[PDB]
Design an enzyme around this catalytic site. Structure first.
Site, PDB file in Angstrom:
ATOM      1  N   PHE A 199       0.284  -1.321   0.234  1.00  0.00           N
ATOM      2  CA  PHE A 199       0.171  -0.217   0.466  1.00  0.00           C
ATOM      3  C   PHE A 199       0.543   1.289  -0.359  1.00  0.00           C
ATOM      4  O   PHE A 199       1.647   1.224   0.738  1.00  0.00           O
ATOM      5  CB  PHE A 199      -1.217  -0.120   1.017  1.00  0.00           C
ATOM      6  CG  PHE A 199      -1.966   0.731   1.287  1.00  0.00           C
ATOM      7  CD1 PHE A 199      -2.556   2.196   0.319  1.00  0.00           C
ATOM      8  CD2 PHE A 199      -2.544   1.609   2.631  1.00  0.00           C
ATOM      9  CE1 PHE A 199      -3.479   3.082   0.409  1.00  0.00           C
ATOM     10  CE2 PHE A 199      -3.446   2.601   2.731  1.00  0.00           C
ATOM     11  CZ  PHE A 199      -3.866   3.092   1.886  1.00  0.00           C
TER      12      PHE A 199
ATOM     13  N   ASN B 156       6.486   2.848  12.377  1.00  0.00           N
ATOM     14  CA  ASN B 156       5.356   3.527  11.440  1.00  0.00           C
ATOM     15  C   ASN B 156       4.312   4.271  11.961  1.00  0.00           C
ATOM     16  O   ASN B 156       3.198   4.075  12.102  1.00  0.00           O
ATOM     17  CB  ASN B 156       5.479   3.648  10.145  1.00  0.00           C
ATOM     18  CG  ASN B 156       4.826   4.158   8.867  1.00  0.00           C
ATOM     19  OD1 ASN B 156       4.702   5.136   9.232  1.00  0.00           O
ATOM     20  ND2 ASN B 156       5.253   3.488   8.172  1.00  0.00           N
ATOM     21  N   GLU B 157       4.827   4.723  13.292  1.00  0.00           N
ATOM     22  CA  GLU B 157       3.444   5.413  14.360  1.00  0.00           C
ATOM     23  C   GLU B 157       1.517   6.293  12.947  1.00  0.00           C
ATOM     24  O   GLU B 157       1.152   6.298  13.394  1.00  0.00           O
ATOM     25  CB  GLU B 157       3.801   6.528  15.094  1.00  0.00           C
ATOM     26  CG  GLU B 157       3.202   6.965  15.835  1.00  0.00           C
ATOM     27  CD  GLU B 157       2.910   6.021  17.339  1.00  0.00           C
ATOM     28  OE1 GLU B 157       3.011   4.724  17.433  1.00  0.00           O
ATOM     29  OE2 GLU B 157       1.025   5.712  17.681  1.00  0.00           O
TER      30      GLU B 157
ATOM     31  N   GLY C 181      -6.050  12.248   0.404  1.00  0.00           N
ATOM     32  CA  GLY C 181      -6.904  11.379   0.649  1.00  0.00           C
ATOM     33  C   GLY C 181      -7.199  10.089  -0.262  1.00  0.00           C
ATOM     34  O   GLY C 181      -7.760   9.607  -0.433  1.00  0.00           O
ATOM     35  N   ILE C 182      -5.767  10.553  -1.189  1.00  0.00           N
ATOM     36  CA  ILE C 182      -6.195   9.084  -2.007  1.00  0.00           C
ATOM     37  C   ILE C 182      -5.696   7.825  -1.372  1.00  0.00           C
ATOM     38  O   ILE C 182      -6.881   6.889  -1.565  1.00  0.00           O
ATOM     39  CB  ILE C 182      -4.710   9.118  -2.701  1.00  0.00           C
ATOM     40  CG1 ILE C 182      -4.541  10.208  -3.586  1.00  0.00           C
ATOM     41  CG2 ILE C 182      -3.709   8.164  -3.578  1.00  0.00           C
ATOM     42  CD1 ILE C 182      -3.720  10.363  -4.942  1.00  0.00           C
TER      43      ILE C 182
ATOM     44  N   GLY D 154      -1.707  12.927   1.754  1.00  0.00           N
ATOM     45  CA  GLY D 154      -2.134  13.973   2.303  1.00  0.00           C
ATOM     46  C   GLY D 154      -3.314  14.141   1.715  1.00  0.00           C
ATOM     47  O   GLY D 154      -3.781  15.580   1.929  1.00  0.00           O
TER      48      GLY D 154
ATOM     49  N   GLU E 210       1.177 -14.773  17.527  1.00  0.00           N
ATOM     50  CA  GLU E 210       1.899 -14.699  19.422  1.00  0.00           C
ATOM     51  C   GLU E 210       1.820 -16.545  19.226  1.00  0.00           C
ATOM     52  O   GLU E 210       1.205 -16.749  19.792  1.00  0.00           O
ATOM     53  CB  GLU E 210       1.063 -14.174  20.165  1.00  0.00           C
ATOM     54  CG  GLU E 210       2.570 -13.775  20.877  1.00  0.00           C
ATOM     55  CD  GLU E 210       2.661 -11.957  19.585  1.00  0.00           C
ATOM     56  OE1 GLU E 210       3.913 -12.152  20.512  1.00  0.00           O
ATOM     57  OE2 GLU E 210       1.968 -12.216  18.485  1.00  0.00           O
TER      58      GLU E 210
ATOM     59  N   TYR F 122      -4.516   3.883  10.331  1.00  0.00           N
ATOM     60  CA  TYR F 122      -4.827   2.689  10.643  1.00  0.00           C
ATOM     61  C   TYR F 122      -6.223   2.040  11.521  1.00  0.00           C
ATOM     62  O   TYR F 122      -6.963   2.236  11.243  1.00  0.00           O
ATOM     63  CB  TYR F 122      -4.213   1.293  10.431  1.00  0.00           C
ATOM     64  CG  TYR F 122      -3.732   0.958   8.883  1.00  0.00           C
ATOM     65  CD1 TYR F 122      -4.039   1.058   7.369  1.00  0.00           C
ATOM     66  CD2 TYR F 122      -2.135   0.630   8.801  1.00  0.00           C
ATOM     67  CE1 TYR F 122      -3.577   0.598   6.537  1.00  0.00           C
ATOM     68  CE2 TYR F 122      -1.141   0.106   7.418  1.00  0.00           C
ATOM     69  CZ  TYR F 122      -2.229   0.377   6.414  1.00  0.00           C
ATOM     70  OH  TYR F 122      -2.100  -0.088   4.928  1.00  0.00           O
TER      71      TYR F 122
HETATM   72  C1  LIG Z   1      -1.375   7.512   4.317  1.00  0.00           C
HETATM   73  C2  LIG Z   1      -0.689   6.336   2.731  1.00  0.00           C
HETATM   74  C3  LIG Z   1      -0.764   4.814   3.462  1.00  0.00           C
HETATM   75  C4  LIG Z   1      -1.137   6.220   1.576  1.00  0.00           C
HETATM   76  O1  LIG Z   1      -2.376   7.128   2.138  1.00  0.00           O
HETATM   77  P1  LIG Z   1      -2.085   8.808   1.725  1.00  0.00           P
HETATM   78  O2  LIG Z   1      -3.318   9.038   0.313  1.00  0.00           O
HETATM   79  O3  LIG Z   1      -1.045   9.385   2.057  1.00  0.00           O
HETATM   80  O4  LIG Z   1      -3.281   9.628   2.649  1.00  0.00           O
HETATM   81  P2  LIG Z   1      -4.697  10.193   2.905  1.00  0.00           P
HETATM   82  O5  LIG Z   1      -4.074  11.275   2.128  1.00  0.00           O
HETATM   83  O6  LIG Z   1      -6.167   9.302   2.496  1.00  0.00           O
HETATM   84  O7  LIG Z   1      -4.578  11.079   4.225  1.00  0.00           O
HETATM   85  C5  LIG Z   1      -4.287  10.018   5.162  1.00  0.00           C
HETATM   86  C6  LIG Z   1      -4.743  11.541   6.605  1.00  0.00           C
HETATM   87  O8  LIG Z   1      -4.568  12.701   5.339  1.00  0.00           O
HETATM   88  C7  LIG Z   1      -5.283  13.525   6.507  1.00  0.00           C
HETATM   89  N1  LIG Z   1      -5.871  13.962   4.989  1.00  0.00           N
HETATM   90  C8  LIG Z   1      -6.706  13.551   3.859  1.00  0.00           C
HETATM   91  N2  LIG Z   1      -7.011  13.997   2.908  1.00  0.00           N
HETATM   92  C9  LIG Z   1      -6.329  15.207   3.634  1.00  0.00           C
HETATM   93  C10 LIG Z   1      -6.958  16.241   2.342  1.00  0.00           C
HETATM   94  N3  LIG Z   1      -7.888  16.869   1.447  1.00  0.00           N
HETATM   95  N4  LIG Z   1      -6.752  17.752   3.175  1.00  0.00           N
HETATM   96  C11 LIG Z   1      -5.858  17.611   4.272  1.00  0.00           C
HETATM   97  N5  LIG Z   1      -5.571  16.572   5.189  1.00  0.00           N
HETATM   98  C12 LIG Z   1      -5.958  15.201   4.751  1.00  0.00           C
HETATM   99  C13 LIG Z   1      -5.462  12.727   7.242  1.00  0.00           C
HETATM  100  O9  LIG Z   1      -4.388  13.516   8.558  1.00  0.00           O
HETATM  101  C14 LIG Z   1      -5.484  11.515   7.560  1.00  0.00           C
HETATM  102  O10 LIG Z   1      -4.737  11.798   8.651  1.00  0.00           O
HETATM  103  P3  LIG Z   1      -4.953  10.198  10.067  1.00  0.00           P
HETATM  104  O11 LIG Z   1      -3.745   9.070   9.284  1.00  0.00           O
HETATM  105  O12 LIG Z   1      -4.344  10.947  11.048  1.00  0.00           O
HETATM  106  O13 LIG Z   1      -6.039   9.949  10.307  1.00  0.00           O
HETATM  107  C15 LIG Z   1       1.530   6.990   2.734  1.00  0.00           C
HETATM  108  O14 LIG Z   1       1.655   7.300   4.163  1.00  0.00           O
HETATM  109  C16 LIG Z   1       2.303   5.861   2.052  1.00  0.00           C
HETATM  110  O15 LIG Z   1       2.384   5.555   1.005  1.00  0.00           O
HETATM  111  N6  LIG Z   1       3.248   6.119   3.389  1.00  0.00           N
HETATM  112  C17 LIG Z   1       4.351   5.751   2.675  1.00  0.00           C
HETATM  113  C18 LIG Z   1       3.951   3.905   2.963  1.00  0.00           C
HETATM  114  C19 LIG Z   1       3.479   3.165   4.315  1.00  0.00           C
HETATM  115  O16 LIG Z   1       3.618   3.936   5.364  1.00  0.00           O
HETATM  116  N7  LIG Z   1       2.598   2.264   3.646  1.00  0.00           N
HETATM  117  C20 LIG Z   1       2.366   0.977   4.424  1.00  0.00           C
HETATM  118  C21 LIG Z   1       3.011   0.535   5.149  1.00  0.00           C
HETATM  119  S1  LIG Z   1       4.552  -0.267   4.919  1.00  0.00           S
END
Ligand SMILES: CC(C)(COP(=O)(O)OP(=O)(O)OC[C@H]1O[C@@H](n2cnc3c(N)ncnc32)[C@H](O)[C@@H]1OP(=O)(O)O)[C@@H](O)C(=O)NCCC(=O)NCCS
Ligand SMILES: CC(C)(COP(=O)(O)OP(=O)(O)OC[C@H]1O[C@@H](n2cnc3c(N)ncnc32)[C@H](O)[C@@H]1OP(=O)(O)O)[C@@H](O)C(=O)NCCC(=O)NCCS
Lengths: 167, 167
Positions: free
Chosen positions: A91, A130-131, A101-102, A99, A149, A137
């Site tokens: 993912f 990864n907090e 919303g994707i 950030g 476990e 999640y």
């Molecule tokens: C979140 C992740 C999994 C992919 O998703 P993403 O597109 O960034 O995340 P989203 O934009 O839907 O945002 C989640 C958040 O954005 C913030 N957000 C969402 N839409 C937003 C918008 N339109 N405007 C501002 N902030 C927004 C929220 O705070 C939510 O944070 P929350 O986590 O505290 O509930 C990303 O961290 C990624 O690739 N991360 C690195 C790899 C990773 O950790 N992968 C999973 C496991 S190895």
């Protein structure tokens, strides 16, 4: 942006994203799968994985000229006690596209797939440090799964599988 | 004995064996899957698991009158770095039928399935206290798999999947 199932034409992008994730984890050289592999394993007559991809408008393509900026790779698994599970394997959303919303929309789509398939749960691994993803999640209802476990994970690699297959 | 792929008619035996294994692990009440579930998930148009069963001659059926005395339940998974994997989920032979070579032949058959499918490895979990199975596996080439070290397993259950699917 649009979240949609991948097509055979997206394999190039899937491998690119797989490598960006591997690089984010400082293990990019670990990736030995090829584009041909993904095409064959993902869109051949029997898919060994399924993939959703996040596509942005042309106006906002990456500096490299790519429209796909995120993805989720999953497959279904089975638990002899409860049945069908949706297992989320990879993912990842590109840095410049996080950030927005994707990732949330990809997870909503995965949830619909899980319910359509009548899976009772979606399982996945998250790195201990990864907090930010852990919070992501858990805010969406995830909880720790203690099922493993007291158990050790083992592998029998090709060399040994071939040996047993021909003994 | 004969090791062969299960058929829809074996579902009754598969559930019976699933429960004997759960009982061996003192968690039989955990099993909520039904025979109908197994039939649907295993022999419907899309199997969510595959199963091999060990069948003995009628002369040697169990005291209960059953011909199936062992089984292995598996499904294929995917690793974005290396590709196809064969994941062995349940593996069990009834007490009175162990030490006869049934488990070894089931593993040989699984190995052939792995090679036919071009899986690079077979993965599975073994309880930490079970030195006998640990030795069984390691004598056949298994090794520890460290891939999940530093990672936490999480689940998002149906309630929350439904919530996200309909938000
Ligand atoms: C979140 C992740 C999994 C992919 O998703 P993403 O597109 O960034 O995340 P989203 O934009 O839907 O945002 C989640 C958040 O954005 C913030 N957000 C969402 N839409 C937003 C918008 N339109 N405007 C501002 N902030 C927004 C929220 O705070 C939510 O944070 P929350 O986590 O505290 O509930 C990303 O961290 C990624 O690739 N991360 C690195 C790899 C990773 O950790 N992968 C999973 C496991 S190895
Ligand atoms: C081994 C097991 C997985 C199923 O297989 P099985 O039919 O008993 O085992 P096999 O008969 O092929 O025997 C393996 C052995 O029998 C002995 N053996 C095999 N064939 C034999 C024969 N014809 N005569 C005498 N001894 C024999 C060997 O010592 C091998 O032991 P080794 O483990 O040290 O290499 C069984 O332990 C089972 O269901 N165990 C409990 C549940 C469990 O632990 N499951 C796996 C994980 S939860």
């Amino acid at each position: 942006f649009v979240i949609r199932p991948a097509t055979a034409a997206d394999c190039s992008d899937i491998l690119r994203l797989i490598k960006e994730l591997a690089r984010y984890e400082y293990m990019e050289e670990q990736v030995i799968l090829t584009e041909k592999d993904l095409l064959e394993d993902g869109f051949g007559e029997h898919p060994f994985y399924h993939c959703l991809v996040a596509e942005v408008p042309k106006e906002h393509w990456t500096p490299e000229g790519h429209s796909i900026v995120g993805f989720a790779m999953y497959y279904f698994t089975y638990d002899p006690w409860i049945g069908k599970l949706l297992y989320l394997e990879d993912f990842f959303v590109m840095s410049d596209y996080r950030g927005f919303g994707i990732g949330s929309e990809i997870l909503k789509n995965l949830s619909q797939v899980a319910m359509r398939c009548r899976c009772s749960s979606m399982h996945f691994l998250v790195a201990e440090w990864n907090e930010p993803s852990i919070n992501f999640y858990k805010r969406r209802g995830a909880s720790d799964l203690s099922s493993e476990e007291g158990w050790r994970l083992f592998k029998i690699d090709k060399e040994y599988l071939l040996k047993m297959a021909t003994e």
